[PDB]
Amino acid sequence: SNAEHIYRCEDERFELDVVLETNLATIRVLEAIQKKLSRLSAEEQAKFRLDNTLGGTSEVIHRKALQRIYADKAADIIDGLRKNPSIAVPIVLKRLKMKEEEWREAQRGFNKVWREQNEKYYLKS
């Protein structure tokens, strides 16, 4: 046939599709908060703080995404978000944005090319 057997996409897409979706959701929320921050004062970081923000229901999304990049020190970063938003959020977001583009690069390789190959003419061989 080709090499030996037809190796169709396994779980690779699943990992990327989910992690990118999770990424984008966290990208949105952090950029939203960071924009609302616009560098706040100490008393303002006390006033406007992630009390119910990034939590409630969709916390697992950002929590998991953050634990994936900061596995060992996830608590420290989570605490930072729940404490000093105008400090942690800008930094963590910048880490997340560079990682976003890197994940996007991976998505380009797996998901994007998969899109191309699947929608185009695969032929009858």
Partner: peptide, 27 residues
């Protein structure tokens, strides 16, 4: 090795730097 490298976890270098920055903010 590939066209895209699946790196999910950040290195202790990056992680620790973040922590250093968070607890300092010297800017």
């Amino acid at each position: 090795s590939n066209a895209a490298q699946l790196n999910y976890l950040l290195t202790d270098e990056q992680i620790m730097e973040d922590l250093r920055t968070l607890n300092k903010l010297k800017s």
